[PDB]
Design a protein around this ligand. Sequence first.
Ligand SMILES: [Zn+2]
Ligand SMILES: [Zn+2]
Lengths: 65, 7
Amino acid sequence: DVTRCICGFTHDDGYMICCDKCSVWQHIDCMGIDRQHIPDTYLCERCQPRNLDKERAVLLQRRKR
Amino acid sequence: ARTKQTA
Ligand SMILES: [Zn+2]
Ligand SMILES: [Zn+2]
């Protein structure tokens, strides 16, 4: 029941994905996950470090509040 | 993966 996305927003935007290791939920749009290409296994950006555009995530989520 | 699509 924990949300921790790179955008920092805690609302549910209608399409989220759960880290298989730490169980936090993230918005697929923020994480650049294509709804047509959901992976079998998913790890968040802490459990599988990688670079993402945080500012893009924030601006996308602002208009979803 | 586990996802959720809240409507
Ligand atoms: Zn997000
Ligand atoms: Zn994780």
